[PDB]
Protein backbone atom coordinates (compact mmCIF):
# COMPACT_ATOMS: atom_id res chain seq x y z
CA UNK A 1 0.00 0.00 0.00
CA UNK A 2 2.75 2.39 -1.05
CA UNK A 3 0.86 4.36 -3.75
CA UNK A 4 3.92 6.47 -4.49
CA UNK A 5 4.22 4.37 -7.64
CA UNK A 6 3.84 7.41 -9.89
CA UNK A 7 6.87 8.82 -8.10
CA UNK A 8 8.78 5.53 -8.12
CA UNK A 9 8.21 5.24 -11.85
CA UNK A 10 9.24 8.87 -12.23
CA UNK A 11 12.47 8.08 -10.37
CA UNK A 12 13.38 4.94 -12.33
CA UNK A 13 12.48 6.89 -15.48
CA UNK A 14 15.09 9.47 -14.51
CA UNK A 15 17.59 6.74 -13.60
CA UNK A 16 17.38 5.32 -17.10
CA UNK A 17 18.69 8.55 -18.60
CA UNK A 18 21.06 9.34 -15.72
CA UNK A 19 23.05 6.13 -15.86
CA UNK A 20 22.18 5.87 -19.54
CA UNK A 21 23.45 8.90 -21.39
CA UNK A 22 27.13 7.97 -21.21
CA UNK A 23 29.20 5.14 -22.78
CA UNK A 24 30.19 5.18 -26.47
CA UNK A 25 27.73 2.85 -28.00
CA UNK A 26 24.04 3.17 -28.92
CA UNK A 27 23.60 -0.62 -28.84
CA UNK A 28 22.79 -0.16 -25.16
CA UNK A 29 21.21 3.15 -26.09
CA UNK A 30 18.16 1.30 -27.32
CA UNK A 31 17.93 -0.57 -24.02
CA UNK A 32 18.19 2.58 -21.93
CA UNK A 33 15.50 4.41 -23.87
CA UNK A 34 13.00 1.55 -24.21
CA UNK A 35 13.28 1.03 -20.46
CA UNK A 36 12.68 4.70 -19.70
CA UNK A 37 9.86 4.94 -22.25
CA UNK A 38 8.02 1.90 -20.98
CA UNK A 39 8.29 3.46 -17.55
CA UNK A 40 6.77 6.47 -19.29
CA UNK A 41 3.79 4.29 -20.07
CA UNK A 42 3.92 3.68 -16.34
CA UNK A 43 3.58 7.36 -15.46
CA UNK A 44 1.08 8.39 -18.13
CA UNK A 45 -1.08 5.36 -17.39
CA UNK A 46 -0.97 5.91 -13.64
CA UNK A 47 -2.49 9.32 -14.33
CA UNK A 48 -5.15 7.56 -16.38
CA UNK A 49 -3.60 8.50 -19.72
CA UNK A 50 -4.57 5.12 -21.06
CA UNK A 51 -4.75 5.81 -24.79
CA UNK A 52 -1.84 8.24 -24.92
CA UNK A 53 0.25 5.82 -22.87
CA UNK A 54 -0.61 3.13 -25.38
CA UNK A 55 0.48 5.42 -28.20
CA UNK A 56 3.90 6.01 -26.68
CA UNK A 57 3.71 2.25 -26.21
CA UNK A 58 3.08 1.76 -29.94
CA UNK A 59 4.65 4.52 -32.07
CA UNK A 60 7.64 5.46 -29.96
CA UNK A 61 8.53 2.07 -28.46
CA UNK A 62 7.75 0.00 -31.53
CA UNK A 63 8.20 2.40 -34.40
CA UNK A 64 10.96 4.68 -33.15
CA UNK A 65 13.13 2.36 -31.11
CA UNK A 66 12.66 -0.53 -33.56
CA UNK A 67 13.80 1.65 -36.45
CA UNK A 68 16.72 2.99 -34.42
CA UNK A 69 17.94 -0.41 -33.29
CA UNK A 70 17.43 -1.51 -36.87
CA UNK A 71 19.72 1.16 -38.33
CA UNK A 72 22.26 0.94 -35.50
CA UNK A 73 22.28 -2.82 -35.90
CA UNK A 74 22.75 -2.35 -39.64
CA UNK A 75 25.23 0.54 -39.60
CA UNK A 76 27.52 -0.63 -36.80
CA UNK A 77 28.65 -4.21 -36.34
CA UNK A 78 29.84 -5.17 -32.88
CA UNK A 79 32.41 -7.90 -32.48
CA UNK A 80 33.46 -7.06 -28.91
CA UNK A 81 30.42 -5.26 -27.45
CA UNK A 82 32.22 -4.70 -24.12
CA UNK A 83 31.43 -2.65 -21.00
CA UNK A 84 33.38 0.23 -22.60
CA UNK A 85 33.89 3.45 -20.65
CA UNK A 86 32.52 6.97 -19.98
CA UNK A 87 29.96 5.68 -17.46
CA UNK A 88 31.97 7.32 -14.65
CA UNK A 89 30.29 10.72 -14.93
CA UNK A 90 26.95 8.94 -15.39
CA UNK A 91 27.25 7.16 -12.05
CA UNK A 92 28.72 10.26 -10.41
CA UNK A 93 25.67 12.16 -11.68
CA UNK A 94 23.61 9.29 -10.27
CA UNK A 95 25.21 10.23 -6.94
CA UNK A 96 24.89 13.99 -7.49
CA UNK A 97 21.39 13.37 -8.83
CA UNK A 98 20.96 10.83 -6.02
CA UNK A 99 21.52 13.42 -3.27
CA UNK A 100 20.11 16.08 -5.61
CA UNK A 101 17.06 13.92 -6.35
CA UNK A 102 17.01 12.95 -2.68
CA UNK A 103 17.50 16.68 -2.05
CA UNK A 104 14.29 17.50 -3.96
CA UNK A 105 12.53 14.51 -2.30
CA UNK A 106 14.09 15.53 1.05
CA UNK A 107 13.69 19.33 1.04
CA UNK A 108 10.22 18.44 -0.25
CA UNK A 109 8.97 19.32 3.25
CA UNK A 110 6.48 22.13 2.58
CA UNK A 111 7.55 23.52 -0.82
CA UNK A 112 10.84 22.56 -2.50
CA UNK A 113 12.39 24.07 -5.63
CA UNK A 114 15.70 25.07 -7.24
CA UNK A 115 17.59 28.33 -7.68
CA UNK A 116 18.52 27.64 -11.33
CA UNK A 117 15.26 26.61 -13.00
CA UNK A 118 11.76 27.97 -12.37
CA UNK A 119 10.02 27.41 -9.06
CA UNK A 120 8.54 24.08 -8.05
CA UNK A 121 6.83 23.41 -4.75
CA UNK A 122 6.71 19.97 -3.15
CA UNK A 123 5.40 17.81 -0.29
CA UNK A 124 3.81 14.39 0.10
CA UNK A 125 0.26 14.42 -1.34
CA UNK A 126 -1.03 14.38 -4.90
CA UNK A 127 -3.98 15.97 -6.71
CA UNK A 128 -6.22 14.08 -9.12
CA UNK A 129 -9.58 13.62 -10.78
CA UNK A 130 -13.15 13.69 -9.50
CA UNK A 131 -16.46 15.00 -10.80
CA UNK A 132 -17.32 11.98 -12.91
CA UNK A 133 -18.53 12.54 -16.47
CA UNK A 134 -20.77 9.76 -17.69
CA UNK A 135 -19.40 7.67 -20.55
CA UNK A 136 -16.47 9.97 -21.36
CA UNK A 137 -12.81 9.15 -21.68
CA UNK A 138 -12.00 12.88 -21.35
CA UNK A 139 -9.20 12.02 -23.80
CA UNK A 140 -10.30 9.93 -26.75
CA UNK A 141 -13.25 12.26 -27.12
CA UNK A 142 -10.60 14.94 -27.30
CA UNK A 143 -9.10 13.21 -30.28
CA UNK A 144 -12.53 12.87 -31.85
CA UNK A 145 -12.23 16.64 -31.62
CA UNK A 146 -8.97 16.32 -33.54
CA UNK A 147 -10.97 15.04 -36.45
CA UNK A 148 -13.83 17.46 -35.88
CA UNK A 149 -11.95 20.64 -34.89
CA UNK A 150 -8.42 19.80 -36.02
CA UNK A 151 -8.98 20.78 -39.64
CA UNK A 152 -6.06 23.16 -40.01
CA UNK A 153 -3.97 21.08 -37.65
CA UNK A 154 -4.34 17.76 -39.47
CA UNK A 155 -3.72 19.65 -42.71
CA UNK A 156 -0.34 20.97 -41.60
CA UNK A 157 0.62 17.64 -40.03
CA UNK A 158 -0.25 15.45 -43.00
CA UNK A 159 1.36 17.86 -45.43
CA UNK A 160 4.51 17.93 -43.31
CA UNK A 161 4.54 14.14 -43.49
CA UNK A 162 4.09 13.69 -47.26
CA UNK A 163 6.87 16.24 -47.51
CA UNK A 164 8.50 13.81 -45.10
CA UNK A 165 8.41 11.19 -47.84
CA UNK A 166 9.73 13.29 -50.70
CA UNK A 167 12.45 14.73 -48.49
CA UNK A 168 13.68 11.41 -47.15
CA UNK A 169 13.78 9.60 -50.47
CA UNK A 170 15.11 12.75 -52.15
CA UNK A 171 18.05 12.58 -49.72
CA UNK A 172 18.51 8.84 -50.32
CA UNK A 173 19.04 9.70 -54.00
CA UNK A 174 16.27 8.56 -56.27
CA UNK A 175 17.18 11.17 -58.91
Amino acid sequence: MMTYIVFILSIIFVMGFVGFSSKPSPIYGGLGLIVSGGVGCGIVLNFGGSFLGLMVFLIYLGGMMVVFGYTTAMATEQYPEVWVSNKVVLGTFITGLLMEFLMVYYVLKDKEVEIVFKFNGMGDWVIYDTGDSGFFSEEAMGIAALYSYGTWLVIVTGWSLLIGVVVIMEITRGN
Binding site: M1, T3, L45, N46, F47, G48, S50, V126, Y128, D129
Partner: peptide, 9 residues
Protein backbone atom coordinates in the same frame (compact mmCIF):
# COMPACT_ATOMS: atom_id res chain seq x y z
CA UNK B 1 -7.26 7.32 -0.60
CA UNK B 2 -5.72 4.34 -2.41
CA UNK B 3 -8.98 3.17 -3.97
CA UNK B 4 -10.43 6.66 -4.37
CA UNK B 5 -7.42 8.43 -5.89
CA UNK B 6 -5.77 5.48 -7.67
CA UNK B 7 -8.84 3.26 -7.47
CA UNK B 8 -10.61 3.88 -10.76
CA UNK B 9 -7.47 3.35 -12.81
Amino acid sequence: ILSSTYGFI
